């Protein structure tokens, strides 16, 4: 039983701190999308006016 | 013959005049300039984390 609980977590020692990095550097890519968003944002808004 | 007449008393008496740009402006939705949110600062920054990150994760539950 003791056996069965230990070779779990060798295997998730590892493979978890994979995870770990890989969710904050996703946020962070995510972070320079804001940028992008302003880019969008006032060429609607320009077009918009343009059009009253 | 009366389109002559119709012709010519109409266009030469009719004098456009219309509205200023000013008064059109009203009508109208102004012009935006440039938008300038910033650059927000997030969490996750500054050593507020790094001793918290060090003695959170030193014990979590299940």
């Known amino acids: ?14 493979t978890t701190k994979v995870l770990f990095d890989v969710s ?3 946020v ?4 320079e999308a804001f940028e992008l968003k302003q880019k969008v944002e006032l060429a609607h808004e320009a077009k ?3 059009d009253s | 013959n009366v389109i002559q007449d ?22 109208v939705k102004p012009w935006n300039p440039p938008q300038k949110p910033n650059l927000p600062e997030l969490e ?19």
Not at chain 1, 28 to 31: A, I, K, Q, T
Not at chain 2, 6 to 27: F, H, I, M, V
Not at chain 2, 47 to 57: D, G, I
């Open chain 1, 24 to 26: 904050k550097e996703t």
């Open chain 2, 44 to 62: 996750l920054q500054g050593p507020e984390a790094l001793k918290a990150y060090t003695e959170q994760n030193v014990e979590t539950a299940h």
């Open chain 2, 6 to 27: 119709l012709y010519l008393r109409e266009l030469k008496d009719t004098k456009l005049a219309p509205s200023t740009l000013q008064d059109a402006e009203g009508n």
């Open chain 1, 28 to 31: 962070e890519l995510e972070s």
């Open chain 1, 1 to 14: 039983d003791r056996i069965d609980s230990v070779s779990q977590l060798q295997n998730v020692a590892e």
């Open chain 1, 48 to 50: 918009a006016v343009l």
